[PDB]
JSON list of C-alpha atoms and ligand atoms in Angstrom, two decimals:
[
{"chain": "A", "resi": 2, "resn": "UNK", "atom": "CA", "xyz": [84.07, -1.86, -41.14]},
{"chain": "A", "resi": 3, "resn": "UNK", "atom": "CA", "xyz": [85.57, 0.80, -39.08]},
{"chain": "A", "resi": 4, "resn": "UNK", "atom": "CA", "xyz": [85.30, 0.97, -35.52]},
{"chain": "A", "resi": 5, "resn": "UNK", "atom": "CA", "xyz": [85.31, 4.68, -35.44]},
{"chain": "A", "resi": 6, "resn": "UNK", "atom": "CA", "xyz": [82.81, 5.33, -37.94]},
{"chain": "A", "resi": 7, "resn": "UNK", "atom": "CA", "xyz": [80.47, 2.87, -36.25]},
{"chain": "A", "resi": 8, "resn": "UNK", "atom": "CA", "xyz": [80.58, 4.91, -32.97]},
{"chain": "A", "resi": 9, "resn": "UNK", "atom": "CA", "xyz": [79.31, 7.92, -34.92]},
{"chain": "A", "resi": 10, "resn": "UNK", "atom": "CA", "xyz": [76.29, 5.89, -36.13]},
{"chain": "A", "resi": 11, "resn": "UNK", "atom": "CA", "xyz": [75.51, 3.93, -33.09]},
{"chain": "A", "resi": 12, "resn": "UNK", "atom": "CA", "xyz": [75.44, 7.60, -31.07]},
{"chain": "A", "resi": 13, "resn": "UNK", "atom": "CA", "xyz": [73.19, 9.65, -34.12]},
{"chain": "A", "resi": 14, "resn": "UNK", "atom": "CA", "xyz": [70.69, 6.07, -34.34]},
{"chain": "A", "resi": 15, "resn": "UNK", "atom": "CA", "xyz": [70.78, 3.85, -31.92]},
{"chain": "A", "resi": 16, "resn": "UNK", "atom": "CA", "xyz": [72.05, 5.62, -28.28]},
{"chain": "A", "resi": 17, "resn": "UNK", "atom": "CA", "xyz": [68.41, 7.16, -27.43]},
{"chain": "A", "resi": 18, "resn": "UNK", "atom": "CA", "xyz": [67.03, 3.75, -26.90]},
{"chain": "A", "resi": 19, "resn": "UNK", "atom": "CA", "xyz": [69.99, 1.44, -26.28]},
{"chain": "A", "resi": 20, "resn": "UNK", "atom": "CA", "xyz": [73.50, 1.64, -24.20]},
{"chain": "A", "resi": 21, "resn": "UNK", "atom": "CA", "xyz": [76.39, -0.71, -24.90]},
{"chain": "A", "resi": 22, "resn": "UNK", "atom": "CA", "xyz": [78.66, -0.62, -21.11]},
{"chain": "A", "resi": 23, "resn": "UNK", "atom": "CA", "xyz": [78.47, -3.79, -18.84]},
{"chain": "A", "resi": 24, "resn": "UNK", "atom": "CA", "xyz": [75.87, -3.29, -16.25]},
{"chain": "A", "resi": 25, "resn": "UNK", "atom": "CA", "xyz": [74.69, -0.27, -18.32]},
{"chain": "A", "resi": 26, "resn": "UNK", "atom": "CA", "xyz": [70.68, 0.15, -17.98]},
{"chain": "A", "resi": 27, "resn": "UNK", "atom": "CA", "xyz": [67.82, -0.54, -20.27]},
{"chain": "A", "resi": 28, "resn": "UNK", "atom": "CA", "xyz": [66.20, 2.60, -21.99]},
{"chain": "A", "resi": 29, "resn": "UNK", "atom": "CA", "xyz": [63.38, 2.14, -24.25]},
{"chain": "A", "resi": 30, "resn": "UNK", "atom": "CA", "xyz": [65.32, -1.06, -25.67]},
{"chain": "A", "resi": 31, "resn": "UNK", "atom": "CA", "xyz": [67.91, -3.49, -23.73]},
{"chain": "A", "resi": 32, "resn": "UNK", "atom": "CA", "xyz": [71.66, -2.87, -22.49]},
{"chain": "A", "resi": 33, "resn": "UNK", "atom": "CA", "xyz": [73.33, -4.53, -25.85]},
{"chain": "A", "resi": 34, "resn": "UNK", "atom": "CA", "xyz": [76.19, -5.75, -23.43]},
{"chain": "A", "resi": 35, "resn": "UNK", "atom": "CA", "xyz": [77.37, -9.58, -24.28]},
{"chain": "A", "resi": 36, "resn": "UNK", "atom": "CA", "xyz": [75.36, -9.26, -27.58]},
{"chain": "A", "resi": 37, "resn": "UNK", "atom": "CA", "xyz": [77.45, -11.32, -29.84]},
{"chain": "A", "resi": 38, "resn": "UNK", "atom": "CA", "xyz": [76.91, -14.89, -29.80]},
{"chain": "A", "resi": 39, "resn": "UNK", "atom": "CA", "xyz": [74.02, -15.13, -27.95]},
{"chain": "A", "resi": 40, "resn": "UNK", "atom": "CA", "xyz": [70.62, -15.77, -28.48]},
{"chain": "A", "resi": 41, "resn": "UNK", "atom": "CA", "xyz": [67.72, -13.39, -29.56]},
{"chain": "A", "resi": 42, "resn": "UNK", "atom": "CA", "xyz": [65.53, -11.94, -26.45]},
{"chain": "A", "resi": 43, "resn": "UNK", "atom": "CA", "xyz": [68.23, -12.73, -24.09]},
{"chain": "A", "resi": 44, "resn": "UNK", "atom": "CA", "xyz": [69.32, -9.53, -21.84]},
{"chain": "A", "resi": 45, "resn": "UNK", "atom": "CA", "xyz": [68.29, -10.02, -18.19]},
{"chain": "A", "resi": 46, "resn": "UNK", "atom": "CA", "xyz": [66.02, -7.68, -16.63]},
{"chain": "A", "resi": 47, "resn": "UNK", "atom": "CA", "xyz": [64.44, -6.56, -20.00]},
{"chain": "A", "resi": 48, "resn": "UNK", "atom": "CA", "xyz": [60.33, -7.43, -20.72]},
{"chain": "A", "resi": 49, "resn": "UNK", "atom": "CA", "xyz": [61.03, -8.71, -24.60]},
{"chain": "A", "resi": 50, "resn": "UNK", "atom": "CA", "xyz": [58.40, -9.09, -27.38]},
{"chain": "A", "resi": 51, "resn": "UNK", "atom": "CA", "xyz": [57.63, -13.01, -27.61]},
{"chain": "A", "resi": 52, "resn": "UNK", "atom": "CA", "xyz": [58.73, -12.34, -31.45]},
{"chain": "A", "resi": 53, "resn": "UNK", "atom": "CA", "xyz": [62.26, -10.95, -30.26]},
{"chain": "A", "resi": 54, "resn": "UNK", "atom": "CA", "xyz": [61.89, -14.04, -27.80]},
{"chain": "A", "resi": 55, "resn": "UNK", "atom": "CA", "xyz": [61.36, -16.43, -30.22]},
{"chain": "A", "resi": 56, "resn": "UNK", "atom": "CA", "xyz": [62.84, -15.73, -33.33]},
{"chain": "A", "resi": 57, "resn": "UNK", "atom": "CA", "xyz": [65.95, -18.54, -32.33]},
{"chain": "A", "resi": 58, "resn": "UNK", "atom": "CA", "xyz": [68.71, -17.06, -34.49]},
{"chain": "A", "resi": 59, "resn": "UNK", "atom": "CA", "xyz": [72.26, -16.35, -32.76]},
{"chain": "A", "resi": 60, "resn": "UNK", "atom": "CA", "xyz": [73.03, -12.76, -32.82]},
{"chain": "A", "resi": 61, "resn": "UNK", "atom": "CA", "xyz": [76.75, -12.69, -35.25]},
{"chain": "A", "resi": 62, "resn": "UNK", "atom": "CA", "xyz": [77.90, -10.32, -38.41]},
{"chain": "A", "resi": 63, "resn": "UNK", "atom": "CA", "xyz": [75.61, -12.43, -40.60]},
{"chain": "A", "resi": 64, "resn": "UNK", "atom": "CA", "xyz": [72.12, -12.15, -38.72]},
{"chain": "A", "resi": 65, "resn": "UNK", "atom": "CA", "xyz": [72.73, -8.05, -37.36]},
{"chain": "A", "resi": 66, "resn": "UNK", "atom": "CA", "xyz": [73.84, -7.24, -41.38]},
{"chain": "A", "resi": 67, "resn": "UNK", "atom": "CA", "xyz": [70.08, -8.87, -41.94]},
{"chain": "A", "resi": 68, "resn": "UNK", "atom": "CA", "xyz": [68.24, -7.23, -39.09]},
{"chain": "A", "resi": 69, "resn": "UNK", "atom": "CA", "xyz": [69.34, -3.37, -39.19]},
{"chain": "A", "resi": 70, "resn": "UNK", "atom": "CA", "xyz": [68.58, -3.41, -42.84]},
{"chain": "A", "resi": 71, "resn": "UNK", "atom": "CA", "xyz": [65.16, -4.11, -41.98]},
{"chain": "A", "resi": 72, "resn": "UNK", "atom": "CA", "xyz": [64.00, -4.80, -38.03]},
{"chain": "A", "resi": 73, "resn": "UNK", "atom": "CA", "xyz": [60.37, -5.31, -38.70]},
{"chain": "A", "resi": 74, "resn": "UNK", "atom": "CA", "xyz": [60.56, -7.88, -41.97]},
{"chain": "A", "resi": 75, "resn": "UNK", "atom": "CA", "xyz": [63.22, -9.72, -39.61]},
{"chain": "A", "resi": 76, "resn": "UNK", "atom": "CA", "xyz": [61.25, -10.04, -36.60]},
{"chain": "A", "resi": 77, "resn": "UNK", "atom": "CA", "xyz": [57.79, -9.26, -36.85]},
{"chain": "A", "resi": 78, "resn": "UNK", "atom": "CA", "xyz": [56.08, -7.71, -34.20]},
{"chain": "A", "resi": 79, "resn": "UNK", "atom": "CA", "xyz": [58.97, -6.35, -32.91]},
{"chain": "A", "resi": 80, "resn": "UNK", "atom": "CA", "xyz": [58.17, -3.08, -30.32]},
{"chain": "A", "resi": 81, "resn": "UNK", "atom": "CA", "xyz": [61.81, -1.77, -32.02]},
{"chain": "A", "resi": 82, "resn": "UNK", "atom": "CA", "xyz": [60.55, 1.00, -33.84]},
{"chain": "A", "resi": 83, "resn": "UNK", "atom": "CA", "xyz": [63.69, 1.98, -35.99]},
{"chain": "A", "resi": 84, "resn": "UNK", "atom": "CA", "xyz": [63.35, 2.17, -40.21]},
{"chain": "A", "resi": 85, "resn": "UNK", "atom": "CA", "xyz": [66.51, 0.46, -40.44]},
{"chain": "A", "resi": 86, "resn": "UNK", "atom": "CA", "xyz": [70.28, 1.11, -42.05]},
{"chain": "A", "resi": 87, "resn": "UNK", "atom": "CA", "xyz": [70.06, 0.85, -45.93]},
{"chain": "A", "resi": 88, "resn": "UNK", "atom": "CA", "xyz": [73.95, 1.54, -46.86]},
{"chain": "A", "resi": 89, "resn": "UNK", "atom": "CA", "xyz": [75.72, -2.09, -46.10]},
{"chain": "A", "resi": 90, "resn": "UNK", "atom": "CA", "xyz": [79.15, 0.14, -45.37]},
{"chain": "A", "resi": 91, "resn": "UNK", "atom": "CA", "xyz": [77.13, 2.09, -43.05]},
{"chain": "A", "resi": 92, "resn": "UNK", "atom": "CA", "xyz": [75.92, -1.70, -41.43]},
{"chain": "A", "resi": 93, "resn": "UNK", "atom": "CA", "xyz": [79.40, -3.18, -41.10]},
{"chain": "A", "resi": 94, "resn": "UNK", "atom": "CA", "xyz": [80.77, 0.02, -39.82]},
{"chain": "A", "resi": 95, "resn": "UNK", "atom": "CA", "xyz": [78.06, -0.26, -36.64]},
{"chain": "A", "resi": 96, "resn": "UNK", "atom": "CA", "xyz": [78.67, -4.21, -36.65]},
{"chain": "A", "resi": 97, "resn": "UNK", "atom": "CA", "xyz": [82.48, -3.71, -36.20]},
{"chain": "A", "resi": 98, "resn": "UNK", "atom": "CA", "xyz": [81.75, -0.73, -33.43]},
{"chain": "A", "resi": 99, "resn": "UNK", "atom": "CA", "xyz": [78.77, -3.39, -31.46]},
{"chain": "A", "resi": 100, "resn": "UNK", "atom": "CA", "xyz": [81.79, -6.35, -31.76]},
{"chain": "A", "resi": 101, "resn": "UNK", "atom": "CA", "xyz": [84.22, -4.11, -29.77]},
{"chain": "A", "resi": 102, "resn": "UNK", "atom": "CA", "xyz": [81.79, -2.16, -27.57]},
{"chain": "A", "resi": 103, "resn": "UNK", "atom": "CA", "xyz": [79.29, -4.94, -26.47]},
{"chain": "A", "resi": 104, "resn": "UNK", "atom": "CA", "xyz": [82.55, -6.90, -24.60]},
{"chain": "A", "resi": 105, "resn": "UNK", "atom": "CA", "xyz": [84.62, -3.87, -23.19]},
{"chain": "B", "resi": 201, "resn": "HEC", "atom": "C1", "xyz": [64.05, 2.90, -30.18]},
{"chain": "B", "resi": 201, "resn": "HEC", "atom": "C2", "xyz": [63.54, 3.83, -30.60]},
{"chain": "B", "resi": 201, "resn": "HEC", "atom": "C3", "xyz": [64.97, 2.10, -30.46]},
{"chain": "B", "resi": 201, "resn": "HEC", "atom": "C4", "xyz": [65.94, 2.45, -31.70]},
{"chain": "B", "resi": 201, "resn": "HEC", "atom": "C5", "xyz": [66.09, 3.75, -31.90]},
{"chain": "B", "resi": 201, "resn": "HEC", "atom": "C6", "xyz": [66.61, 1.47, -31.43]},
{"chain": "B", "resi": 201, "resn": "HEC", "atom": "N1", "xyz": [66.59, 0.30, -30.82]},
{"chain": "B", "resi": 201, "resn": "HEC", "atom": "FE1", "xyz": [66.85, -1.32, -30.57]},
{"chain": "B", "resi": 201, "resn": "HEC", "atom": "N2", "xyz": [65.51, -2.20, -29.50]},
{"chain": "B", "resi": 201, "resn": "HEC", "atom": "C7", "xyz": [64.77, -1.40, -29.24]},
{"chain": "B", "resi": 201, "resn": "HEC", "atom": "C8", "xyz": [64.01, -2.07, -28.58]},
{"chain": "B", "resi": 201, "resn": "HEC", "atom": "C9", "xyz": [62.17, -1.33, -27.88]},
{"chain": "B", "resi": 201, "resn": "HEC", "atom": "C10", "xyz": [64.04, -3.59, -28.69]},
{"chain": "B", "resi": 201, "resn": "HEC", "atom": "C11", "xyz": [63.09, -4.68, -28.08]},
{"chain": "B", "resi": 201, "resn": "HEC", "atom": "C12", "xyz": [62.53, -5.32, -29.30]},
{"chain": "B", "resi": 201, "resn": "HEC", "atom": "C13", "xyz": [61.24, -6.11, -29.10]},
{"chain": "B", "resi": 201, "resn": "HEC", "atom": "O1", "xyz": [60.78, -6.48, -29.87]},
{"chain": "B", "resi": 201, "resn": "HEC", "atom": "O2", "xyz": [61.25, -7.00, -27.54]},
{"chain": "B", "resi": 201, "resn": "HEC", "atom": "C14", "xyz": [65.36, -3.41, -29.39]},
{"chain": "B", "resi": 201, "resn": "HEC", "atom": "C15", "xyz": [65.93, -4.54, -29.65]},
{"chain": "B", "resi": 201, "resn": "HEC", "atom": "C16", "xyz": [67.25, -4.66, -30.35]},
{"chain": "B", "resi": 201, "resn": "HEC", "atom": "C17", "xyz": [68.09, -5.89, -30.70]},
{"chain": "B", "resi": 201, "resn": "HEC", "atom": "C18", "xyz": [67.86, -7.16, -29.65]},
{"chain": "B", "resi": 201, "resn": "HEC", "atom": "C19", "xyz": [68.31, -7.35, -28.67]},
{"chain": "B", "resi": 201, "resn": "HEC", "atom": "C20", "xyz": [67.92, -8.84, -28.09]},
{"chain": "B", "resi": 201, "resn": "HEC", "atom": "O3", "xyz": [68.99, -9.19, -26.98]},
{"chain": "B", "resi": 201, "resn": "HEC", "atom": "O4", "xyz": [68.08, -9.89, -28.88]},
{"chain": "B", "resi": 201, "resn": "HEC", "atom": "C21", "xyz": [69.13, -5.50, -31.03]},
{"chain": "B", "resi": 201, "resn": "HEC", "atom": "C22", "xyz": [70.65, -6.11, -31.65]},
{"chain": "B", "resi": 201, "resn": "HEC", "atom": "C23", "xyz": [69.02, -3.85, -31.34]},
{"chain": "B", "resi": 201, "resn": "HEC", "atom": "N3", "xyz": [67.90, -3.38, -30.92]},
{"chain": "B", "resi": 201, "resn": "HEC", "atom": "C24", "xyz": [70.02, -3.09, -31.91]},
{"chain": "B", "resi": 201, "resn": "HEC", "atom": "C25", "xyz": [69.72, -1.83, -31.97]},
{"chain": "B", "resi": 201, "resn": "HEC", "atom": "C26", "xyz": [70.73, -0.59, -33.20]},
{"chain": "B", "resi": 201, "resn": "HEC", "atom": "C27", "xyz": [71.90, -1.28, -33.24]},
{"chain": "B", "resi": 201, "resn": "HEC", "atom": "C28", "xyz": [69.89, 0.65, -33.43]},
{"chain": "B", "resi": 201, "resn": "HEC", "atom": "C29", "xyz": [70.67, 1.56, -34.28]},
{"chain": "B", "resi": 201, "resn": "HEC", "atom": "C30", "xyz": [70.87, 1.05, -35.46]},
{"chain": "B", "resi": 201, "resn": "HEC", "atom": "C31", "xyz": [68.71, 0.31, -32.09]},
{"chain": "B", "resi": 201, "resn": "HEC", "atom": "N4", "xyz": [68.39, -0.59, -31.95]},
{"chain": "B", "resi": 201, "resn": "HEC", "atom": "C32", "xyz": [67.88, 1.53, -32.58]},
{"chain": "B", "resi": 201, "resn": "HEC", "atom": "C33", "xyz": [65.01, -0.05, -29.25]},
{"chain": "B", "resi": 201, "resn": "HEC", "atom": "C34", "xyz": [65.38, 0.82, -30.44]}
]
């Protein structure tokens, strides 16, 4: 995936509710810094749904690929109200951007 195409998708579709920077603020949704290799629902200082807390999978390329296609199907009862990214290549580009941006 292309990091530069990923940034653009992030700004257009995710930045409304999320920051990526170290120490960045919680908005509607949690700051995503350090996401990769962490379990679901682990950002300090954010109140998650029990569904997001208990899903019990590790965020990596494979799990983000499935989640971003249909967030409500993957985590039923999530309060992330977002339709998903249907195109595999848009998901790949976004995940490449997140993998860089969420550890600086
Ligand atoms: C608001 C309208 C949001 C948009 C647009 C996006 N997200 Fe979100 N996201 C939001 C909330 C309220 C939550 C918490 C959900 C809960 O049930 O508690 C989330 C959660 C995530 C997560 C999980 C984080 C974790 O620590 O487990 C991820 C990985 C995530 N969101 C990513 C994401 C991306 C990449 C977005 C654009 C494609 C996106 N979100 C949009 C709120 C909102």
